[PDB]
Amino acid sequence: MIHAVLIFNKKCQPRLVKFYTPVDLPKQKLLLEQVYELISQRNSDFQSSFLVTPPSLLLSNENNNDEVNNEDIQIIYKNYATLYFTFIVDDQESELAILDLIQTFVESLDRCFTEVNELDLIFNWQTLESVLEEIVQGGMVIETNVNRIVASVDELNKAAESTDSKIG
Amino acid sequence: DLNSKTNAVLKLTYLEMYGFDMAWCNFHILEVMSSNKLQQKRVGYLAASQSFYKDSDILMLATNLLKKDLKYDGNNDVVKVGIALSGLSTIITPSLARDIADDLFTMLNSTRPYIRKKAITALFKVFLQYPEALRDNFDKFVSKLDDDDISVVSAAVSVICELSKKNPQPFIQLSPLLYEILVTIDNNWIIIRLLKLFTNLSQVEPKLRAKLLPKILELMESTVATSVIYESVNCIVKGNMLEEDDFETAMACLERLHTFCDSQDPNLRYISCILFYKIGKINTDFISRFDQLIIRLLSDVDVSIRSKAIELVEGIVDEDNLKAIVQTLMKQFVDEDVVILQTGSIVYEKSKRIPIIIPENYKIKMVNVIISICSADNYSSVNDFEWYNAVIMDLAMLCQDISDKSLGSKIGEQFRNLMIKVPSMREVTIANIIKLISNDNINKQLPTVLRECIWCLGEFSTLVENGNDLIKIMTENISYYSHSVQEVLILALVKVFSNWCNNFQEDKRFEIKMVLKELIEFFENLSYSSTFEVQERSVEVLEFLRLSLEALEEDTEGLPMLLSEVLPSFFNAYEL
Amino acid sequence: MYLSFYITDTKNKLIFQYLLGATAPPQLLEDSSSDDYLDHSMVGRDLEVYKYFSVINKLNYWCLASTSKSKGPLDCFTFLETIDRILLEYFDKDKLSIKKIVNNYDRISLIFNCCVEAGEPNVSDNELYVDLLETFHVVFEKKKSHLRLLTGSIHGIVDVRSYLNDNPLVAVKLNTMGNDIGIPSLHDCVEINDGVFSPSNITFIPPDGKFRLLEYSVDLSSQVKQSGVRMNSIGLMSLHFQNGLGKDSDEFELSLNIENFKKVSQVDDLKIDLQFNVENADPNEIAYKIKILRNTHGRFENSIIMGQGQWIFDKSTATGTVPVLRGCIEYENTGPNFTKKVDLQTVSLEYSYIGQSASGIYVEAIDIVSGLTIGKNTKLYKGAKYKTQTGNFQVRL
Amino acid sequence: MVDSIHRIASALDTAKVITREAAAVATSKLGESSYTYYSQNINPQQLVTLLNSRNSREVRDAMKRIISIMASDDDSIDVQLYFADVVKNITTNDTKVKRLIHLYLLRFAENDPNLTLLSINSLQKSLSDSNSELRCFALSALSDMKMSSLAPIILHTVKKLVTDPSAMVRGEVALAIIKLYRAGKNDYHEELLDILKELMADTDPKVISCAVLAYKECYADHLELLHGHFRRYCRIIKQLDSWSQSYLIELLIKYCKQYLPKPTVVDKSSEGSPRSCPLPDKYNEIEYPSYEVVNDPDLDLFLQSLNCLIYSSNPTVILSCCNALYQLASPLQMKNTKFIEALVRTVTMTENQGNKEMLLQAIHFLSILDQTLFLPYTKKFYVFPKDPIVASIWKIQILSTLINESNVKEIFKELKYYVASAHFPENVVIMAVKSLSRCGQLSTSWESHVMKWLIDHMESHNLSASVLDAYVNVIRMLVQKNPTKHLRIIFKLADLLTVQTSLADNARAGIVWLFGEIASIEFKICPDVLRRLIQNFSNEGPETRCQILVLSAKLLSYDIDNFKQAQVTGSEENNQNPPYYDFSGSRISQMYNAVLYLAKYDDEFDIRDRARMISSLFDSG
């Protein structure tokens, strides 16, 4: 179970976080921040993509890759051109499921928002979210297929268009 | 207005997402859910689902509202249904559950996989509450589990999993169907889950584990992913599936790990290294196959890897290997180390020069390992004892920058053991120790090292020459020392003096005499330590010395006799 | 050897650092709200480097030092306080808030250096208004019907805001209402010249700047004893807690007569925090309600939960007038486990006066000496304001 | 943890410091946002460049950063490069610059001759200049340089600058004369004296503080001179602002450590005479003795002064004074009672919390060096109940050092009260114990009230383990001084330990010892105690084990002689008996054997070695 996803821009501002379960928000954040930081410390080539951490590296600083952990929480990072995506999962969701869901998410985002900028993501955050949700639901990513994901996003855009000032 | 409603709803959601009251926002959400539009229905449903927990009117209203929306397929039906269900599921009351179940059941029968997925997820949340509903709906699930769409299957599965988390017995019933789905899925994420589920069922039901094990390992073999592989491994390692009979299964899993470790992505690497270590604690043989993988991970720059390696190094060591590793670590550390001792740079690859790199916590562990290694078997086989001794002395130096005291402590304990072993090396070790003591940096921070040293000296003063420097060191440094050290020092000193006098034939050397006098003053001074125990220890040794002095003054040869006459008398006197 | 100095805010944010000399490379930070707390960190290796630290807190800022090995933690701290203070004077004063500090980080650095190289730490060391402010705090122990002042700490600050241009001298004679007044502490612009000025007299020289002229901390116990003062007003506020209680109420009549305050000038804010022991009774056992307390010039608000009275007497009540603060305490109990006893413990009354003398340092005369006359340009200002704070009276019943 | 906190503080300084640097530069071209830069990896290039920018704000800003870094430990920082540039700026007639420059110099001089010499020449010239401001600043640096070659320069200068009428110059000329001696001592001493004299006689606090800060240095060595000079200094203090008073305290600390002028016959008949005081021999006013130091207007004025400054109600001048009084003291000085009285009056005066502790510390230090003094002050340090764990801890440490007779009763009453009252933390109660102990060490008439209290506290209150450790060390000390109250005490303890089989490692270490100790008085009974202990070694930590061994060992001894001749067994001398012989090898052995075996098996060697020796010696008789 993904308990949460976070999409940050280059300037570290999160832009989307989804939490499928409740968890205490003050804890969720702390996690998001630590992850943000570590991201900055990691190099562009590293950008780490992940930061698994024993909790104790939660953060501990001493070897600066001290990773981040919080015990039972694995953090997966993915840098893309200017956005960063971080997924926090519980120990019971398999890493692969998490990675795939990420890689799929990202690929989808790039496919849908080919130029994503922070403004475009923002504006179309509702779309980004929908994508994430759909991917998740019933615990299930139900369309996995990068081609559908790309379409589904369009299906949603069709709705928001019919409403647009409550939207745009 | 509808466009305005969408706006209000956005603001409410933003508040409910914060950590804010949700009950206060329900009514306003319902009015929005009464809008025929499907989008507004969705945004409303989300808020209500984030909120509903407990408030009944909120729920009831949401229900009646969701029902009307469900019953009708709706034709954007996927969305309306889809959202509504999620919504309903995230709402739980018995009144609602009763309603919902009947609604979900109807929806499970929609065509569109999106709908089917949602419906399934919903029936999950519901069941998490109301068992009667489960029962009635248990059947539908079984029928849905058989739909052609892999996402729908994946969902049916997750749900059955939850219900196992809560009910396992009902689902130990369905396990066969689950096993049949896993055998039909192309998708990696889906395979991964199914695997987890079975592991979950195994915690409850070893019978299943058997049926599924082989389904796992075949899937891992057909999927590439990477996660499906890690998973099969965690399952094997967990169900405790393993038991040792299952080593074979485990082996396959490991072999897949070793391949992966050997991919460039640190996430996979770290994971494998861990899984390897674990298996090793559990299966030494696997470790011997995976030594290579480890050594390679040592030259890897990733601190989490390095740490995991050092931990592996501790349970693998062979002699050639030991020596290699030691040197490799010592060297590395002289070259890998510093960054974080100093602060805390982050890493770089690029400098071709490299910022260099180990945290403080690593430096500590390393030293600890070096100590264990020297003591296992027993490394009666460091062939070169010299190297060990050196290493230990070096570690002490670097740790001075580290403190953490524990490093400094462990290092000392070891150094002791080594000295005890390897009589040759003892003199070298003593000389080095003394020098370190006279370098001030050990005094700061390091009492332990001082203590051990002191010990090694009383024991081996019989090898050492300069039993003076040792003593004048120790005497001057005594005032700078901790109580445990002080005590240790005093004691060691006295031990030496006794030995010397008996052995002093170096000449007697006039120094023994001078040194005795000094030791006297000092011990008196220490008689003023806050901890009386240490105080008395001093005064005692003060007398002894005074005696020996009287003796040496008369002769050289006549000294042991005289000392064997008085010293025991004194000491016994005081204590007596 | 090296020394470093750093400054930090109350929230642990570093505001300034400095190093001096040489080779130089969480709880205490938090405890810092206690105004005192940050304390040594050993960077260390065997070069002992020792570190040390010290920190200082003042008015939300804190300062950290370091030293290398030897010097003692004292030389470091002495250097820190000297710095901090120098930061207060400079920055005028009222606050060095992290915002203010960070503002004058530079003037803070140089101020440091000047304190170092010399080798040694150099050690570490027109209108006139006289506003005597006094914050008393007194720990009374009720024994036998008489509240015997066990301790007390009247912290006087005598500030004098000035606007001269030259250096006229001021003599300030302080009267003793036969309490040999023992120590007025004098501000860096003030001189108490030598027993010429006797222990009762003070002489201040211009600064331009407001200046605390003399802080006087009279330890009431000796004074009151030397002077015999059952404070009959002030401080010995005789609180008779009358039982005649019922299960929930009690009436305690605390009269803060200001019989002994007639020339004590205004009291700017007497905050009577009546703590009701909650230490031995659990704040739930002590539910208490304070219903009516009558002041003639202030306000009674109650923080029960926390187990505290606060009665804030506004500065208007001044003389002879006796703000009798009677009223009733009602101990409300959610449990029965309150036995209707609240050992009545320590009623801390923090008085702040203005314009009177912490020790009884009433200035019986202030005389300017310099061949000056009145209207030879010297004016008697208004609005020096001393403030004095201690902690806080405590009557223990 | 601490290193990470320091890095976070540096980052916070860079945030606020970088914003401040940018705003300031608008001007400095700018050097505002630097700091925050270097404070997060700032460098020398940025600095040097700033010096070479033309604008005075920049030239100043630069000088600043340069001083902060070389100071911050951005250690990486060379200092010769900053030096040369700064020296060039010394020859700028702008005081602000001259000042900064001097502040830097000393920064370097801390090491290098050319850099020093350069700074020196530039300083000398500025010293032969009539400008009192520059002369001073310059002379100051010359003093913080360390060098013996610079002495003949600095001197001629210093002499001329003393003979200058200016108060600023007089402040500095003292610093120099001082830092000068700290190096090239002989040629220079005659003058450097007759000089420091005229000086000390200035009014300006920065001048006085300086001559003081000076005298504090030169005299480390030439203390005869310092005296005649030290006076005005001590006088000036009693007369002065509570800031400058603290400074004069620090010095008066060092001086004394040097001039004890000599006792030689010490004339206690000189004035107002303490031991007496000389006047210097070279002045030769009828030689007045040395211990000048405790008496003479210089030393004395110091001690008395310290008192006044402390009596003077200022907590600072008070804490300092205490520190100084801690050093002078020939222990005869602190015994001065006055010093203590002062500190005390302060503490209690001190309302302000930071100070409460400061005072509690001093007091402790003074009690440490002198107890019998803090006595007419205790009732004061009765512990302010509003306070913290450390504060309560200190109070205890005091009450424990103060105890006289007329004070003790009260003290005990207070402690007993505090223990019962404050929700005292474990650590407190722990110290509270170490005190009451240190008390009876002095009073006998009161000791009874003490022990009774302690025991009643231990047995009564619910005490923690750590606490039990102290109380044990205490009851031990009291027994050590008051053997009559002793036996009663022991009985009370034996009862407590036997109850508490749970005791802590340190507690057991305590109790087990006390009984090894009190055994002399009546080691007929001790074999009963040792038994209750051994029984419990095998289950204990290493330190504890060591303690138990020793105390088995001791007990054993005390009575060997009393055992041996008793044990040296069927030796005949023992079936002969003095009194203790005592039944000896058997009872004592049974105890030791257990202990030994128990040690040999503990990892800690020290415990083992002892056991081994103890056995060998015990066995052989």
Numbering used by the authors:
A (entry chain S): 1 to 168
B (entry chain A): 63 to 638
C (entry chain M): 1 to 25, 39 to 138, 212 to 483
D (entry chain B): 1 to 621
From the primary publication:
Heterotetrameric adapter protein (AP) complexes are required at several endomembranes for cargo binding. Finally, AP-3 functions between the trans Golgi and the vacuole in yeast, whereas mammalian AP-3 localizes to a tubular endosomal compartment, in addition to or instead of the TGN. Here we present cryo-EM structures of the full-length stable 300 kDa yeast AP-3 complex. The structures reveal that AP-3 adopts an open conformation in solution, comparable to the membrane-bound conformations of AP-1 or AP-2.
We selected three classes, which showed the most distinct conformational differences based on the gap created between the N-Apl5 and C-Apm3 subunits as well as the overall length of the AP-3 complex in the 2D class averages and the 3D reconstructions. Indeed, the overall length of the AP-3 complex varied from 11.5 nm in its most compact to 13 nm in its stretched form. Similarly, the distance between the N-Apl5 and C-Apm3 subunits increases from ∼2.2 nm to ∼3.9 nm, demonstrating the variability of the “open” AP-3 complex in solution. A direct comparison with the open and closed conformation of AP-1 revealed that both conformations of AP-3 represent a more open state of adaptor proteins than previously observed for membrane-bound AP-1 or AP-2, in which the N-terminal region of Apl5 is rotated ∼31° (compact) and ∼38° (stretched) upward and tilted away from the core of the complex.
